[PDB]
Amino acid sequence: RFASVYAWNRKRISNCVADYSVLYNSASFSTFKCYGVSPTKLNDLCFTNVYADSFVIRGDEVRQIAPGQTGKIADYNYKLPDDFTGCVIAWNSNNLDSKVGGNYNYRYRLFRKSNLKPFERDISTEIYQAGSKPCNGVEGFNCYFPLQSYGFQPTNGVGYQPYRVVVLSFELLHAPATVCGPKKSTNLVKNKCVNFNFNGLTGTGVLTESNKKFLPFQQFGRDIADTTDAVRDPQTLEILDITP
Amino acid sequence: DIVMTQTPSSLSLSPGDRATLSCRASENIINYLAWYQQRPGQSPRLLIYDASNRATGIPARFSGSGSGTDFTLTISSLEPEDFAVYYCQQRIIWPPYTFGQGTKVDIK
Amino acid sequence: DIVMTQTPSSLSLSPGDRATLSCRASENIINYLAWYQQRPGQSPRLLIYDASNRATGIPARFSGSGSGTDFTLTISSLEPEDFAVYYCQQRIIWPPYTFGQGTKVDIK
Amino acid sequence: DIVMTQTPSSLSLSPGDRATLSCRASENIINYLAWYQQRPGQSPRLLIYDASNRATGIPARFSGSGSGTDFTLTISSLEPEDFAVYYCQQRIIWPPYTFGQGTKVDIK
Amino acid sequence: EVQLVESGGGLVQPGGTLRLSCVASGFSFSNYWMSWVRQAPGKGLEWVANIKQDGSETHYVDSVKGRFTISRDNAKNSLYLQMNSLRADDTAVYFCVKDRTDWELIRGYFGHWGQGTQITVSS
Amino acid sequence: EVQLVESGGGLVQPGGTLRLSCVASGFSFSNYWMSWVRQAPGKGLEWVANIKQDGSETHYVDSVKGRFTISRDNAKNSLYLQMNSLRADDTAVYFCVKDRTDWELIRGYFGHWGQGTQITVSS
Amino acid sequence: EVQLVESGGGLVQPGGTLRLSCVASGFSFSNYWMSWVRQAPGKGLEWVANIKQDGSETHYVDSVKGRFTISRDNAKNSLYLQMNSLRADDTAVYFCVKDRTDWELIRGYFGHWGQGTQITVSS
Ligand SMILES: *[C@@H]1O[C@H](CO)[C@@H](O[C@@H]2O[C@H](CO)[C@@H](O)[C@H](O)[C@H]2NC(C)=O)[C@H](O)[C@H]1NC(C)=O
Ligand SMILES: *[C@@H]1O[C@H](CO)[C@@H](O)[C@H](O)[C@H]1NC(C)=O
């Protein structure tokens, strides 16, 4: 059971091994659009933090789940920032989220004073005031209940049928090493100009045994003028200098 | 010329729950559809004109949606006067102005 | 509700050539169409499900595709068991699940 | 297989005014439609082939327009020989080549 | 409130002649595209004619033309429809219909119907 | 291999009552949305009903409802369909149909039919 | 000018056999996809067959096949259509049709019809 679009769910991914190639080639998704990265380079990146937003919308409102869009879902239900990094996955779910006579468990907001911020969530249920007259907790002329309900019936045209949407969002803030595609931690070497990758840190140089006491909580070493000059090996947890 | 069709013919319901009615056109009209309520033994009454817009004096239980070919009227809670016949009508392609066929909502 | 239509009714062919069959919907379905082969005196058999995807145990002579209103099944070389009846079926708009009408491919 | 339909059946007009005839297909053909003029007691004659393009020997009073599903023939001024029957015909999906039904333009 | 009273319906022979009158009080006659809508006994609604806030484009239903004639009178706030050569299938309930709006672009909606009169054609 | 044996069809009077049974062996009963599909003699295929891997949303064809009832039994690996008040037009060949897949999103495809039984209604 | 004279039609019994001939003078026979088009008395037009500028893909209408046969002769500038087992519904006016163009991509248009011959099948 997914959540409604006006109060959407947000699952946060933790340290893992993620395989996005089995998602990109599942042949069951109606829309797989990545925005901040090419899809084929998904298996090799280490996103400090991954979030997943899951909800249910209509069929002709999937094109509003994109950075910089207009419409009632785009204005105030779910807003995507213009500098997006994750992907949008969307698939038809008429067999699951619809039933005969109408499935009214999926409400959406169609009245709000202002547009939403990106990643803003408005679960308020105040009575909207369309006109200049206040009504103070009752309906009437130009006083509306802000949440309508989707009428989901399986005898609907395609474009009025329930589409399940999952929006993945990746970010690379300051973490030391989080989730990441499946890779083989090939044996490390020393004292040779090498091409290395330390759970995200990509570089080149000679690796050497260190003697700098990396405080139990310091992922790496920063040098004035800001160039990486030390790392910590994730598996054995020892500090190594990176000479060029 | 346009064959308007109401895809359910009769809905058996209970007073209080939700009701959904679907009207399907035979050609692409856009936003130009109205819903009328033929009460038992009374004159018809315009519920919504122009798709989702309500008429004056109509309570907020009635809502409308849909576009292009599929259109839907939704009643939130059936009051005991709402058991009636419902007609959909287009106004963009005339002559003639074609009606639907009727969807008698009754009590069960 | 959806009137599926197979636009040729019968194809007279020779064993060895190709065979094209077209199915046309009355409403926009997308990718959700299957092709069945009613053999003479046997139970039907699913050839392809989901448009261009073949089922397990089906040889590579059968191909398909589409994504809207027009759909086409193609047989590369007619084996002598392939002279049968062919049905197209959608599964996105139910109830009911509507079939085609049949395209009896025979020998000439 | 394609059900071509001429949406008016008969137009009562006066000699001189303009005339419009509409032909509607049951499937998306594109630009491939022709208009023929069955005169009273004569053989038919190709007015326009390929939608808006006129044939050789046809005067400039006849014009054509439309695409996809809706097509329209327009006669600027009715000469007294123009009161005839008009047929629309597609050529992109064969066999068979389907005609329209006829629109008898008469004098009133 | 808007009131739309009407009269004239009854029983005539196939081939007869009727004339329905319709008086309007509540709104302000004229400017409104008045119409006429029939309903067969035990069937859905239909459409007959509509004119103007004047006399222009009487606009019949093309299964009726040459037999019906719709007209109006703004000084008397009245609307008339006349039927000749009744075809033994024009037995219905006829309704006067207003037109929900004041200007021509949003016309076409059957706002504020009246109560209908009955017409039976038989022998 | 998957086998779908079925029985129960025969000859009854208009207004009679039949009950078809259907036993499944090859796959693993339950989880699969079993169905029923008729075919008139000399015509194309049709559809009757389908239920669940449980009992929910029996889902008839709306030219049949109130007269048919589909049910199942997972302990016996069986599927039943009962018909009352046969309308002298339900004379056909009925087929048990599996559903080609295991999870609900890709359901709806009539994978792995069975051989059909015949039902004639006459007097 | 282009002329398309034709002959052969008449009156035969249901189950008879006819053969229509058609001579062309004005253009240059061959290269043109000649055809045949019927029209029922009091109905719209239809289509029967067409061949080639040679003999290939005789292309009938699938309510006729196995009973008609269309052929041609380039040396005599002639086109023939033969009908066997006339089904008492092939009573019409038949027209020889040229094909408006010279090359195969823009073929399909019924340019420059001829005057038709009549065929009645009765007893
Ligand atoms: C990651 O796993 C490796 C083994 O797969 C761990 O290596 C072990 O390290 C301890 C030192 O405390 C040795 O006593 C074991 O013999 C090692 N095992 C093997 C198989 O070599 C390594 O410690 C793990 N990473 C962390 C951070 O603990
Ligand atoms: C925290 O409260 C604010 C109130 O302004 C609300 O808008 C916001 O959605 C809340 N936080 C979350 C994560 O919902």
Short mmCIF file of N, CA and C in Angstrom, two decimals, chain G residues 33-95:
data_model
loop_
_atom_site.label_atom_id
_atom_site.label_comp_id
_atom_site.label_asym_id
_atom_site.label_seq_id
_atom_site.Cartn_x
_atom_site.Cartn_y
_atom_site.Cartn_z
N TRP G 33 -2.08 0.31 -63.82
CA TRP G 33 -2.76 -0.70 -63.00
C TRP G 33 -4.26 -0.61 -63.22
N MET G 34 -4.76 -1.37 -64.19
CA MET G 34 -6.18 -1.36 -64.48
C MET G 34 -6.96 -2.07 -63.38
N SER G 35 -8.21 -1.66 -63.19
CA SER G 35 -9.01 -2.16 -62.08
C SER G 35 -10.44 -2.41 -62.54
N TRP G 36 -11.31 -2.75 -61.59
CA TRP G 36 -12.73 -2.97 -61.85
C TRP G 36 -13.51 -2.56 -60.62
N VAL G 37 -14.54 -1.73 -60.79
CA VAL G 37 -15.29 -1.21 -59.65
C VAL G 37 -16.78 -1.38 -59.93
N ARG G 38 -17.50 -2.00 -59.00
CA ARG G 38 -18.94 -2.16 -59.15
C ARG G 38 -19.70 -1.11 -58.36
N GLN G 39 -20.97 -0.95 -58.71
CA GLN G 39 -21.88 -0.09 -57.95
C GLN G 39 -23.26 -0.73 -57.99
N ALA G 40 -23.79 -1.06 -56.82
CA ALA G 40 -25.12 -1.65 -56.73
C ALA G 40 -26.17 -0.61 -57.09
N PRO G 41 -27.31 -1.03 -57.65
CA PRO G 41 -28.35 -0.06 -58.04
C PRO G 41 -28.99 0.58 -56.81
N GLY G 42 -28.74 1.87 -56.64
CA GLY G 42 -29.24 2.59 -55.49
C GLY G 42 -28.35 2.55 -54.28
N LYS G 43 -27.05 2.31 -54.46
CA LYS G 43 -26.11 2.25 -53.35
C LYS G 43 -24.81 2.91 -53.77
N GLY G 44 -23.84 2.92 -52.86
CA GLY G 44 -22.55 3.52 -53.12
C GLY G 44 -21.64 2.61 -53.91
N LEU G 45 -20.42 3.08 -54.13
CA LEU G 45 -19.47 2.34 -54.93
C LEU G 45 -18.80 1.25 -54.08
N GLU G 46 -18.02 0.41 -54.75
CA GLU G 46 -17.35 -0.72 -54.11
C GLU G 46 -16.03 -0.95 -54.84
N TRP G 47 -15.47 -2.14 -54.72
CA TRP G 47 -14.23 -2.47 -55.40
C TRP G 47 -14.21 -3.97 -55.68
N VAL G 48 -13.60 -4.36 -56.80
CA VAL G 48 -13.59 -5.76 -57.19
C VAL G 48 -12.17 -6.32 -57.26
N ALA G 49 -11.34 -5.78 -58.15
CA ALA G 49 -9.99 -6.31 -58.36
C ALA G 49 -9.14 -5.29 -59.10
N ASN G 50 -7.85 -5.61 -59.23
CA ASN G 50 -6.85 -4.89 -60.02
C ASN G 50 -5.61 -5.76 -60.11
N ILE G 51 -4.86 -5.66 -61.21
CA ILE G 51 -3.76 -6.61 -61.32
C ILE G 51 -2.36 -6.02 -61.27
N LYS G 52 -1.91 -5.37 -62.35
CA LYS G 52 -0.51 -5.00 -62.59
C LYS G 52 -0.48 -4.37 -63.97
N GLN G 53 0.67 -3.86 -64.42
CA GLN G 53 0.98 -3.74 -65.84
C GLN G 53 1.49 -5.06 -66.44
N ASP G 54 1.30 -6.17 -65.73
CA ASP G 54 1.67 -7.53 -66.08
C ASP G 54 0.63 -8.44 -65.43
N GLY G 55 0.96 -9.71 -65.26
CA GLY G 55 0.12 -10.55 -64.43
C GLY G 55 0.75 -10.90 -63.10
N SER G 56 0.32 -10.23 -62.03
CA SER G 56 0.79 -10.48 -60.66
C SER G 56 -0.18 -9.82 -59.69
N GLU G 57 -0.37 -10.47 -58.53
CA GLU G 57 -1.20 -10.04 -57.39
C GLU G 57 -2.58 -9.52 -57.82
N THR G 58 -3.41 -10.47 -58.24
CA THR G 58 -4.72 -10.19 -58.81
C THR G 58 -5.67 -9.50 -57.83
N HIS G 59 -5.49 -9.70 -56.52
CA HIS G 59 -5.97 -8.79 -55.46
C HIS G 59 -7.49 -8.59 -55.45
N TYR G 60 -8.22 -9.62 -55.05
CA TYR G 60 -9.67 -9.54 -54.99
C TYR G 60 -10.14 -8.95 -53.66
N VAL G 61 -11.44 -9.02 -53.38
CA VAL G 61 -12.08 -8.22 -52.33
C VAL G 61 -12.49 -9.06 -51.12
N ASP G 62 -12.20 -10.36 -51.12
CA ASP G 62 -12.39 -11.31 -50.02
C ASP G 62 -13.85 -11.54 -49.65
N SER G 63 -14.80 -11.03 -50.43
CA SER G 63 -16.17 -11.52 -50.43
C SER G 63 -16.52 -12.12 -51.79
N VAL G 64 -15.50 -12.33 -52.61
CA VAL G 64 -15.65 -12.72 -54.01
C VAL G 64 -14.73 -13.86 -54.42
N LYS G 65 -13.63 -14.07 -53.68
CA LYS G 65 -12.49 -14.88 -54.11
C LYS G 65 -12.86 -16.33 -54.38
N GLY G 66 -12.20 -16.91 -55.38
CA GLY G 66 -12.53 -18.23 -55.86
C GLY G 66 -13.62 -18.25 -56.91
N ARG G 67 -14.29 -17.13 -57.16
CA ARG G 67 -15.34 -17.05 -58.15
C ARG G 67 -15.02 -16.10 -59.30
N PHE G 68 -14.16 -15.11 -59.08
CA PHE G 68 -13.81 -14.15 -60.12
C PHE G 68 -12.36 -14.37 -60.53
N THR G 69 -12.02 -13.89 -61.72
CA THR G 69 -10.65 -13.96 -62.20
C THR G 69 -10.42 -12.81 -63.17
N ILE G 70 -9.43 -11.97 -62.88
CA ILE G 70 -9.12 -10.80 -63.70
C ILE G 70 -7.82 -11.07 -64.45
N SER G 71 -7.79 -10.72 -65.73
CA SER G 71 -6.60 -10.90 -66.55
C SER G 71 -6.54 -9.78 -67.58
N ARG G 72 -5.47 -9.77 -68.37
CA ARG G 72 -5.28 -8.70 -69.33
C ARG G 72 -4.53 -9.22 -70.54
N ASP G 73 -4.40 -8.37 -71.55
CA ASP G 73 -3.66 -8.67 -72.77
C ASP G 73 -3.09 -7.36 -73.31
N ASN G 74 -1.77 -7.24 -73.30
CA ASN G 74 -1.12 -6.00 -73.72
C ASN G 74 -1.02 -5.85 -75.22
N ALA G 75 -0.96 -6.97 -75.96
CA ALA G 75 -0.87 -6.89 -77.41
C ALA G 75 -2.18 -6.42 -78.02
N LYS G 76 -3.31 -6.75 -77.40
CA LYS G 76 -4.61 -6.37 -77.91
C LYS G 76 -5.19 -5.15 -77.21
N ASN G 77 -4.47 -4.59 -76.23
CA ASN G 77 -4.92 -3.50 -75.36
C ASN G 77 -6.27 -3.83 -74.73
N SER G 78 -6.31 -4.93 -73.99
CA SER G 78 -7.57 -5.43 -73.50
C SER G 78 -7.44 -5.87 -72.05
N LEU G 79 -8.56 -5.82 -71.34
CA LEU G 79 -8.65 -6.24 -69.95
C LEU G 79 -9.93 -7.05 -69.77
N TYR G 80 -9.82 -8.20 -69.10
CA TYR G 80 -10.92 -9.13 -68.99
C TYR G 80 -11.18 -9.45 -67.53
N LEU G 81 -12.45 -9.67 -67.21
CA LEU G 81 -12.83 -10.16 -65.88
C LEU G 81 -13.88 -11.23 -66.06
N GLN G 82 -13.67 -12.39 -65.44
CA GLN G 82 -14.57 -13.52 -65.60
C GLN G 82 -15.20 -13.87 -64.26
N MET G 83 -16.51 -14.10 -64.28
CA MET G 83 -17.28 -14.41 -63.08
C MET G 83 -17.98 -15.74 -63.26
N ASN G 84 -17.81 -16.63 -62.28
CA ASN G 84 -18.50 -17.90 -62.23
C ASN G 84 -19.27 -18.00 -60.92
N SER G 85 -20.36 -18.77 -60.94
CA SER G 85 -21.27 -19.01 -59.82
C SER G 85 -21.76 -17.69 -59.21
N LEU G 86 -22.53 -16.97 -60.02
CA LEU G 86 -23.04 -15.67 -59.62
C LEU G 86 -24.10 -15.81 -58.53
N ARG G 87 -23.89 -15.10 -57.43
CA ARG G 87 -24.54 -15.38 -56.16
C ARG G 87 -25.85 -14.62 -55.97
N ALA G 88 -26.47 -14.15 -57.05
CA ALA G 88 -27.71 -13.37 -57.06
C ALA G 88 -27.61 -12.07 -56.26
N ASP G 89 -26.40 -11.62 -55.95
CA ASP G 89 -26.15 -10.35 -55.30
C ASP G 89 -25.10 -9.56 -56.04
N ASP G 90 -24.49 -10.14 -57.07
CA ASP G 90 -23.56 -9.44 -57.95
C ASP G 90 -24.29 -8.84 -59.14
N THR G 91 -25.38 -8.13 -58.86
CA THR G 91 -26.12 -7.37 -59.86
C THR G 91 -25.82 -5.90 -59.64
N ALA G 92 -25.15 -5.29 -60.61
CA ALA G 92 -24.55 -3.98 -60.39
C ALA G 92 -24.22 -3.35 -61.73
N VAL G 93 -23.52 -2.22 -61.66
CA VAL G 93 -22.91 -1.60 -62.82
C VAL G 93 -21.40 -1.67 -62.61
N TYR G 94 -20.70 -2.25 -63.57
CA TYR G 94 -19.26 -2.46 -63.48
C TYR G 94 -18.54 -1.45 -64.35
N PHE G 95 -17.46 -0.89 -63.82
CA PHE G 95 -16.68 0.15 -64.46
C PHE G 95 -15.23 -0.30 -64.59
#
